[PDB]
Design an enzyme around this catalytic site. Structure first.
Site, PDB file in Angstrom:
ATOM      1  N   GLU A 264       1.216  -1.618   0.344  1.00 38.76           N
ATOM      2  CA  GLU A 264       0.118   0.130  -0.121  1.00 38.76           C
ATOM      3  C   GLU A 264       0.765   1.445   0.086  1.00 38.76           C
ATOM      4  OE1 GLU A 264      -4.167   0.022   1.990  1.00 38.76           O
ATOM      5  OE2 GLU A 264      -3.758  -2.042   1.806  1.00 38.76           O
TER       6      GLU A 264
ATOM      7  N   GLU B 100     -14.771  27.417  -4.806  1.00 38.68           N
ATOM      8  CA  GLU B 100     -14.759  28.073  -3.703  1.00 38.68           C
ATOM      9  C   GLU B 100     -13.703  27.366  -2.749  1.00 38.68           C
ATOM     10  OE1 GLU B 100     -17.956  29.609  -1.548  1.00 38.68           O
ATOM     11  OE2 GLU B 100     -18.669  31.103  -3.820  1.00 38.68           O
TER      12      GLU B 100
END
Ligand SMILES: *[C@H]1CC(=O)C/C(C)=C\C=C\C(=O)O[C@H]([C@H](O)NC(=O)/C=C\C=C\C)C/C(C)=C/[C@@H]2CSC[C@H](C1)O2
Ligand SMILES: Nc1nc2c(ncn2[C@@H]2O[C@H](COP(=O)(O)OP(=O)(O)OP(=O)(O)O)[C@@H](O)[C@H]2O)c(=O)[nH]1
Ligand SMILES: Nc1ncnc2c1ncn2[C@@H]1O[C@H](COP(=O)(O)OP(=O)(O)CP(=O)(O)O)[C@@H](O)[C@H]1O
Ligand SMILES: Nc1nc2c(ncn2[C@@H]2O[C@H](COP(=O)(O)OP(=O)(O)O)[C@@H](O)[C@H]2O)c(=O)[nH]1
Ligand SMILES: [Ca+2]
Ligand SMILES: [Ca+2]
Ligand SMILES: [Cl-]
Ligand SMILES: [Mg+2]
Ligand SMILES: [Mg+2]
Ligand SMILES: [Mg+2]
EC number: 3.6.5.-
Lengths: 419, 434, 58, 311
Positions: free
Chosen positions: B183, B254
Site C-alpha cells: 500500500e 470556493e
C-alpha cells in the site's frame, strides 16, 4: 473466481483425495455432490473449487499407472469427481523424473491438457491452478513439472500454486528422491508463483513426537497435510478481505519472484479442552507446528499470512498477533513494514472449535534446499544411480545445471537474511 | 444551480459512496425508491439538493453518481441492497478481475481496457447537467483500483473537462485494517500522478477513524461498516454547503479559494466533533469548537501545534448562533497554539446549517444538538507524507515487490520519479511551515 | 465579523483576528506499457519454446 | 519484555539509562531503525516525532518534548520571555536581553539611557563581554555584581537538573552543582568546564555550598536560592505546557533539562539558559539515571531523589 485443481502421481492423488474430502465436508457437500449444509457462508464462494443440483470438484486426477486412482475412485468421496477427469497411463514412472518429464509423461500430457482446457473454458474468470504432488517420485515430480510448464505456455497470465511434498531419507521410498527433487525445484523456481513446501520429515516428526503416534503411516501424514491445505485455502473459499484470491496472496507474500517457497503450519496439534487465542497464536508460530523441517529462528520472515478459524474475539486475535510480532521483532525483516497479515473465518475445521494456519515466507527455508542439495551431491559426485536417467535420454549436464540453480536459490535466501 | 458528479472507485470508494448516498437520502427526505414527497416540483428543478440529485418524470431522485470497480462483488451489493432502486445499471460499472493491490495493474493493464466505458458513463451524466461544476472522487490510496484506476481517470477528466474542479476523498492506509504490504507504493504512485489533477483532497487515515470508533463509540473491533458511517458524516458535513441553501463553499471552486492558496499543498485536515455512542449530556458550542483542536478528533493523527495554518473553515450543524461561535474562538485563541503563515490572514470562515446531523437509524452514532467539522490547511498534515515516504523507502531500497509492477508494464523509473515528487512535496510543506 | 449572510437554513460569516498531458500522451503511455507486457510475454514464450525443443531432443 | 532503541550515541546520560534498562533483564535494545519499540532515546536534531505513536498495539515514549527547543535556544528563550504575558518584558529574574526583527535599535536606546545615568553586556548565540555597544545572537546585561565564594573571590553558576515526565510532572533533582571559577574575579568571567585548587574539578555540591551559606552569610541554600530556582523552573515550564504537553497525544514524551543560574551578591537568582540535552556531573550519573528510569520510564512501563514542583 475459479481455480482448477490438478493432482498427479501417488502422493499427489492421495493427499488431493483427502483435501477434497475435507473441504467437501466444510462446504456441506456429500459424496454424491449434493449440498446438505446449513450456513450460506458455505455456498457463497463454492464455485471457486466446484462446478455446478450437484457440485463437482474442478479437479483433474493424473497418473502414469492406474492403481492409486483406482483407490481414489473406491475411496470415501470417490464418486464426486467427474469421470472424464481421470487421466492415466499404464506403464508407471519407476520413481524416475526423466520418465515423468521426458518419456512416459510426454505420451500422456496432451490428454491431460485437453481436460485442463475443457475445465478452463467453462470458467467465468479463471484465476489459476493448484497442483498437488511429491517431488521425490517420478509422475508427480517429473510429469507434474512438465504439466506446469505446458500450462504456463497456454495460460501465461494465470497464477500457478503448488502443494509440493519434499522427500526425506527418514520417510523415503527410493534413494533417487534427491535427484528427482532437485530437478523439480529448478522447475518450480521458474514456473510457480507460490509453492507450499511440505517436508515429509516434518510430518513424520509431528506425528511421532507431538501426536504420539508410535508408527505413522502415509495415511497419518496425509491427515496433517489435508488439515493444512484446508487452512491455507480458507481465504480463497470463504468471504473475506485478505488474500482472497491467488494473485492478491502472491502480491502480499512474494517480494522477489524466485522466493516463493512457503513454510506452512497448523494449530492445534496435541496428543475436549478449550483452546485460548493465546495458545493458538503461540503454537502457530512454534517450529514444532511447522511443516518444512526448518527452524524459523535460523532465518527471518519476509512475509507471513495467519488465518484463524472459529468463533473467537477478533480483538484478542489482533492483540496476540501484535504481541508475537512486537516480542520477536528481530525475526521479521524490518525493511518490509507490516509484513504479517491476519484473516479470520467464522467456520472451524471439523472436530475443532478453533484453529489457526500459518504461511511463512522465511529465509530459513534455505535449510530444506541445502539438505536436498547435500544428498544430491553425495550421490552425484560418484554419478551413482545416474543410469536410470541417462537411459531415458538425459545428459549429466542437466543435473549440474539443476544443482547450480538450487544452490543459487540458497544463496539468494542468505542474502536477504543478512540484509 | 450547478451540478456535481460523484465518482466512486474501488472497494473503499464504492462502500463509502454507499454510506454517503444513504445519509444524503435521509438528510433530504428521499426514500429508498427515490421518491421525495417534500419536493413539490415534479420531474425537475433547480433546488440546492439538485446539485447531487437529478429527477425523472415519475418523481425519482437519482444520484449524480458513477460507481466503478474492477471486480463485481462490491458493486453487486449496491445493485441488490436497500437503495438499489435509486441507481440505474448504466451508473454501475464492474469488470471481472481486480487490480490485485497493484497500482500498475489498475492504471496500465486493466485501466486501459475500461477507461473509455467509464468516461462514456460519466458523459451521460454530464450531458444531463445545465452547468456542471466538477467531480467528487472517492477512493483508497492502497488498493490497485483505488490507486491506479483513479489516477488514470483523473488525468483523462482533466483532458475532457479541462475547466472543471475535482475534489478527492482519499483513504490513507492503516495496517490495522489494510489488506496489502504494498500500500505505501500504491499511495505514492497515485499521489504523484494525481497531484496536478486534483484541486483539493480530503485524506482520511483509517487509523484515526478506527481509533475514534474504538474510543468514542466503544466498538472493540471496528468493521468497514462502522468506519464508513463515521466517514460519511464527515463527508456530508463537507458537502452540505453544496446541497443546502447557504453562502459558504457553495461551489467547488470556493473549496480551493478558501482552503488552498498554494496548488500542491491541497490537503486540508478535517477534524470532527462530537462523536458519541448511541448506546450511551450535550456539548456546547465552546466544547465542540475546542474539540476541533484536539488531535484525537482529527481524520489524520498529527500535531498542528507544530506547523502553521494557511486557512481554517468551521462548518457547524445544528443549534449554533454566530455570537457563541465568536466567543468560543476568542477563548480558544488565548489557550491554543494557532500560528498562521505570515502571508495569509489569521481568521476563520464559518458556516452554520441549522439542521443537526442526521444519523442512520440503529447506527453507532448518537443524535446530537450541534456538531462541527473544521477544515484546516495546516502544514502538520505533512507528518502523514513523512510516514508513508519512509515506508516506501524501506521497501524500495531492496526493490521488494517491484517486479509485480514492472511485470504489468510499468517502468522502474516511475517509482523514483513518484518518490522525488513526494520529497519535493515534503520540502514545500517545510518551507511554508518553518 | 465580515460577510454575514443569513437564510432560513443557516448563516455564514468570516472572523478575522489579524491581517498579514493530452489524450495523445496518455494513450501513448498506456500503449508503451502494453508493449512492454507483450515483450515480456514474448520472451517467456520463447523460453518455453526452447524447453519444448529440449524435450524433443531428450 | 519492553523494547527501546538508541539514536544518540553521544549522550552520556542515555548511555547510562540504556545500561540500566538492559540490566533489569526486562528491556531489550533493538536496532536503531526497528519501529517496534516502546521507548525511543532519540537523536538531538530532526528527531522524527511525526513517525511516533502509529504502531498498532505499542505504547510509545520518547525522551524529548517536541517544541522544547523554544526554551533551549538563546534567542528563542529571549523571545519566549518577552512575548509571553506570564513571563513578560518586565520578568525580574532574567537579565535584560535583545535578539540581534532585530532589536538592535532597542538595545542601543537602553544602552544610551544607562550610559547617561554599569553598562557591561555579553554577546553570545564565541562570547564577547564589553562596555562598548560598537564592539557588540543575543546581547544580554552582564551581571556586574556576582556572588563570590571565599576564599578566592570566585564566580560560579548553578546547574539544576529537571525531569519532566509524560504527565507534565516537573521534578527537580535534589542534587545540583556549582561550576566555579578558580581565578579571582575582576577565564575568571566564564565558569564553563588553579584548576581544581578549591574543589575537585571546579565543582561544589549542595552540602558544601549550604554549609558555606550558613557559615559565611547566616542563611541556607533552601531559603536564599532554591525557592527562586524552583519558582523560575516552574514558571518557564508551565509557560510552554500548552504548546508541548503530550497529554492527549498518540505518543508520549519526557525530557531532562539542565537549567543554569547565576546568583548576585544580594542573593538574587537569575536564569542564564536552559539546556535541552545536558550532561551530568561524574559522581551524580548513577543516581540521576536511575531516577530517570524510575520516574520517566518505569512509570509508563512497570517492571525519591526529586522534589516535585507542584502546579
Ligand atoms: C481427521 C481425523 C481422524 O482421522 C481421527 C481423529 C479422531 C482425530 C484426529 C485429530 C487430530 O489430528 O487433531 C489435531 C490435533 O491433535 N488436535 C488438537 O490438538 C485438539 C485440541 C487441542 C486442545 C488443547 C488437529 C487436526 C489436524 C485436525 C483435522 C482438522 S481437518 C479434518 C481432520 C480429520 O482433522
Ligand atoms: N474506510 C474504509 N477503508 C476501506 C474500505 N475498503 C477498503 N478499505 C481500505 O482500502 C485499502 C484497500 O483498497 P481497496 O479499495 O479494497 O482496493 P480496490 O480499490 O478495490 O483495488 P483492488 O481490489 O486492488 O482492485 C486498504 O487500506 C483498506 O483498509 C472501506 O469500505 N472503508
Ligand atoms: N549575563 C551573564 N552575566 C554574567 N555571567 C554570564 C552571563 N551570561 C553568561 N555568563 C557566564 O558565561 C558562562 C557561559 O555562558 P552560557 O550560559 O551562555 O554557557 P554555555 O551555553 O556555553 C554552556 P552551559 O550549556 O553548560 O551553560 C556562564 O556559566 C556564566 O559563567
Ligand atoms: N506425505 C506423503 N508422502 C507420500 C505419499 N506417497 C508417497 N509419498 C512420498 O512421495 C515420494 C514418492 O513419490 P510418489 O508420489 O510415490 O511417486 P509418483 O507416483 O511417481 O509421483 C517420496 O518422497 C514418498 O515419501 C503419501 O501418500 N503421502
Ligand atoms: Ca511410452
Ligand atoms: Ca423538483
Ligand atoms: Cl470543461
Ligand atoms: Mg510411490
Ligand atoms: Mg477491490
Ligand atoms: Mg548551553
Amino acid at each position: 473466481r475459479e481455480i482448477v485443481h490438478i493432482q498427479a502421481g501417488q502422493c499427489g492423488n492421495q493427499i488431493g483425495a483427502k483435501f477434497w474430502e475435507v473441504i467437501s465436508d466444510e462446504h456441506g457437500i456429500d459424496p454424491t455432490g449434493s449440498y446438505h449444509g446449513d450456513s450460506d457462508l458455505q455456498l457463497e464462494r463454492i464455485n471457486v473449487y466446484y462446478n455446478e443440483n450437484k457440485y463437482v470438484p474442478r479437479a483433474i486426477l493424473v497418473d502414469l499407472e492406474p492403481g492409486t486412482m483406482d483407490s481414489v475412485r473406491s475411496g470415501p468421496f470417490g464418486q464426486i469427481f467427474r469421470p472424464d477427469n481421470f487421466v492415466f497411463g499404464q506403464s508407471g514412472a519407476g520413481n524416475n523424473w526423466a520418465k515423468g518429464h521426458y518419456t512416459e509423461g510426454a505420451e500422456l500430457v496432451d490428454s491431460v491438457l485437453d481436460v485442463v482446457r475443457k475445465e478452463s473454458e467453462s470458467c467465468d474468470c479463471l484465476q489459476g491452478f493448484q497442483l498437488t504432488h511429491s517431488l521425490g517420485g517420478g509422475t508427480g515430480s517429473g510429469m507434474g513439472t512438465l504439466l506446469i510448464s505446458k500450462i504456463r505456455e497456454e495460460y501465461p497470465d494465470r497464477i500457478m500454486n503448488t502443494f509440493s511434498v519434499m522427500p526425506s531419507p527418514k520417510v523415503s521410498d527410493t534413494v533417487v528422491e534427491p535427484y528427482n527433487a532437485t530437478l523439480s525445484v529448478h522447475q518450480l523456481v521458474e514456473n510457480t508463483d507460490e509453492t507450499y513446501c511440505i517436508d515429509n520429515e516434518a510430518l513424520y516428526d509431528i506425528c511421532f513426537r507431538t501426536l504420539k503416534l508410535t508408527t505413522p503411516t502415509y495415511g497419518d501424514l496425509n491427515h496433517l497435510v489435508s488439515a493444512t491445505m484446508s487452512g491455507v485455502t480458507t481465504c480463497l473459499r470463504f468471504p473475506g478481505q485478505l488474500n482472497a484470491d491467488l494473485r492478491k496472496l502472491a502480491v502480499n507474500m512474494v517480494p522477489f519472484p524466485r522466493l516463493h517457497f512457503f513454510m506452512p503450519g497448523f494449530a492445534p496439534l496435541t496428543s475436549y479442552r478449550a483452546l485460548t487465542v493465546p495458545e493458538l497464536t503461540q503454537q502457530m508460530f512454534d517450529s514444532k507446528n511447522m511443516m518444512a523441517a526448518c527452524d524459523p529462528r535460523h532465518g527471518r520472515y519476509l512475509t507471513v499470512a495467519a488465518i484463524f478459524r472459529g468463533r473467537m474475539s477478533m480483538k484478542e486475535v489482533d492483540e496476540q498477533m501484535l504481541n508475537v510480532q512486537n516480542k520477536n521483532s528481530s525475526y521479521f525483516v524490518e525493511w518490509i513494514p507490516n509484513n504479517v497479515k491476519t484473516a479470520v473465518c467464522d467456520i472451524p475445521p471439523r472436530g475443532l472449535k478453533m484453529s489457526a494456519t500459518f504461511i511463512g515466507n522465511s529465509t530459513a527455508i534455505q535449510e530444506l534446499f541445502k539438505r536436498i542439495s547435500e544428498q544430491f551431491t553425495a550421490m552425484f559426485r560418484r554419478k551413482a544411480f545416474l543410469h536410470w536417467y541417462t537411459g531415458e535420454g538425459m545428459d549429466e549436464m542437466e543435473f549440474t545445471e539443476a544443482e547450480s540453480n538450487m544452490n543459487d536459490l540458497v544463496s539468494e535466501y542468505q542474502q536477504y537474511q543478512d540484509a | 444551480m450547478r451540478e456535481c458528479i460523484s465518482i466512486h472507485v474501488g472497494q473503499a470508494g464504492v462502500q463509502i459512496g454507499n454510506a454517503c448516498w444513504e445519509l444524503y437520502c435521509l438528510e433530504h427526505g428521499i426514500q429508498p425508491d427515490g421518491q421525495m414527497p417534500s419536493d413539490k416540483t415534479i420531474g425537475g428543478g433547480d433546488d440546492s439538493f439538485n446539485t447531487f440529485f437529478s429527477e425523472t418524470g415519475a418523481g425519482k431522485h437519482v444520484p449524480r453518481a458513477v460507481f466503478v470497480d474492477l471486480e463485481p462483488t462490491v458493486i453487486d451489493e449496491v445493485r441488490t441492497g436497500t437503495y438499489r432502486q435509486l441507481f440505474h445499471p448504466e451508473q454501475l460499472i464492474t469488470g471481472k478481475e481486480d487490480a490485485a493491490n497493484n497500482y500498475a495493474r489498475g492504471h496500465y493493464t486493466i485501466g486501459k481496457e475500461i477507461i473509455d466505458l467509464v468516461l462514456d458513463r460519466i458523459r451521460k451524466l454530464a450531458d444531463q447537467c445545465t452547468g456542471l461544476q466538477g467531480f467528487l472522487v472517492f477512493h483508497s490510496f492502497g488498493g490497485g483500483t483505488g490507486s491506479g484506476f483513479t489516477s488514470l481517470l483523473m488525468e483523462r477528466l482533466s483532458v475532457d473537462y479541462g475547466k472543471k474542479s475535482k475534489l478527492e476523498f482519499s483513504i490513507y492506509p492503516a495496517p490495522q485494517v489494510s489488506t496489502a504490504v504494498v500500500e505505501p507504493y500504491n499511495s505514492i504512485l497515485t499521489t504523484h500522478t494525481t497531484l496536478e489533477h486534483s484541486d483539493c483532497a480530503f485524506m482520511v487515515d483509517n487509523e484515526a477513524i478506527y481509533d475514534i470508533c474504538r474510543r468514542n463509540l466503544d466498538i472493540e473491533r471496528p468493521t468497514y461498516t462502522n468506519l464508513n458511517r463515521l466517514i460519511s458524516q464527515i463527508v456530508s458535513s463537507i458537502t452540505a454547503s453544496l446541497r443546502f441553501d447557504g453562502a459558504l463553499n457553495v461551489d467547488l471552486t470556493e473549496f480551493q479559494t478558501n482552503l488552498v492558496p498554494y496548488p500542491r499543498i491541497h490537503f486540508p485536515l478535517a477534524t470532527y466533533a462530537p462523536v458519541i455512542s448511541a448506546e450511551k449530556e450535550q456539548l456546547s458550542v465552546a466544547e465542540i469548537t475546542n474539540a476541533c483542536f484536539e488531535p484525537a478528533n482529527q481524520m489524520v493523527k498529527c500535531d498542528p501545534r507544530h506547523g502553521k495554518y494557511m486557512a481554517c473553515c468551521l462548518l457547524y450543524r445544528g443549534d449554533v448562533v454566530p455570537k457563541d461561535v465568536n466567543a468560543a474562538i476568542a477563548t480558544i485563541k488565548t489557550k491554543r497554539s494557532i500560528q498562521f503563515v505570515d502571508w495569509c490572514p489569521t481568521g476563520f470562515k464559518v458556516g452554520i446549517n441549522y439542521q443537526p446531523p442526521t444519523v442512520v437509524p440503529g447506527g453507532d452514532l448518537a443524535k446530537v444538538q450541534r456538531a462541527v467539522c473544521m477544515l484546516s490547511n495546516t502544514t502538520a498534515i505533512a507528518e502523514a507524507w513523512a510516514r508513508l515516504d519512509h515506508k516506501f523507502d524501506l521497501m524500495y531500497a531492496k526493490r521488494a515487490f517491484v517486479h509485480w509492477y514492472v511485470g504489468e508494464g510499468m517502468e522502474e523509473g516511475e517509482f523514483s520519479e513518484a518518490r522525488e515528487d513526494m520529497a519535493a512535496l515534503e520540502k514545500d510543506y517545510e518551507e511554508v511551515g518553518v | 465579523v465580515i460577510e454575514l449572510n443569513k437564510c432560513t437554513s443557516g448563516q455564514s460569516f468570516e472572523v478575522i483576528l489579524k491581517p498579514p498531458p493530452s489524450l495523445e500522451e496518455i494513450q501513448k503511455k498506456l500503449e508503451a506499457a502494453e508493449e512492454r507486457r507483450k515483450y515480456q510475454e514474448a520472451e517467456l514464450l520463447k523460453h518455453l519454446a526452447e524447453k519444448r525443443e529440449h524435450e524433443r531432443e531428450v | 519484555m519492553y523494547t527501546f532503541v538508541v539514536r544518540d550515541e553521544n549522550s552520556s546520560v542515555y548511555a547510562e539509562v540504556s545500561r540500566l534498562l538492559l540490566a533489569t533483564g526486562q528491556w531489550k535494545r533493538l536496532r536503531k531503525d526497528n519501529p517496534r519499540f516502546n521507548l525511543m532515546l532519540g537523536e538531538r536534531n530532526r528527531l522524527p516525532f511525526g513517525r511516533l505513536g502509529h504502531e498498532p498495539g505499542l505504547v510509545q515514549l520518547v525522551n524529548y518534548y517536541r517544541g522544547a527547543d523554544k526554551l533551549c535556544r538563546k534567542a528563542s528563550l529571549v523571545k519566549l520571555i518577552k512575548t509571553s504575558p506570564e513571563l513578560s518584558e518586565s520578568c525580574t529574574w532574567f537579565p535584560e536581553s535583545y535578539v540581534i526583527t532585530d532589536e538592535r535599535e532597542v538595545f542601543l536606546a537602553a544602552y544610551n539611557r544607562r550610559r547617561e545615568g554599569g553598562n557591561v553586556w555579553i554577546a553570545k548565540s564565541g562570547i564577547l563581554i564589553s562596555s562598548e555597544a560598537s564592539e557588540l545572537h543575543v546581547i544580554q546585561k552582564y551581571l556586574e555584581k556576582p556572588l563570590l565564594l571565599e576564599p578566592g573571590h570566585r564566580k560560579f553558576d548553578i546547574r539544576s537538573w529537571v525531569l519532566v515526565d509524560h504527565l507534565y510532572n516537573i521534578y527537580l533533582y535534589r542534587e545540583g552543582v556549582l561550576r566555579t571559577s578558580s581565578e579571582p574575579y575582576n577565564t575568571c568571567h566564564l565558569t564553563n568546564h588553579n584548576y581544581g585548587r578549591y574543589e575537585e574539578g571546579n565543582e561544589m555540591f549542595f552540602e558544601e555550598f549550604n554549609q558555606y551559606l550558613m557559615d559565611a552569610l547566616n542563611t541556607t541554600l533552601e531559603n536564599s536560592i532554591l525557592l527562586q530556582i524552583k519558582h523560575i523552573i516552574r514558571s518557564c515550564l508551565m509557560c510552554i505546557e500548552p504548546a508541548i504537553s503530550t497529554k492527549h497525544l498518540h505518543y508520549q514524551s519526557f525530557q531532562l533539562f539542565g537549567f543554569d543560574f547565576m546568583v548576585d551578591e544580594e542573593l538574587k537568582v537569575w536564569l542564564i539558559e536552559v539546556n535541552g540535552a545536558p550532561a551530568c556531573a561524574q559522581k551524580l550519573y548513577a543516581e540521576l539515571c536511575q531516577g530517570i528510569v524510575d520516574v520517566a520510564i518505569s512509570s509508563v512501563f512497570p517492571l525519591s531523589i526529586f522534589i516535585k514542583l507542584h502546579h
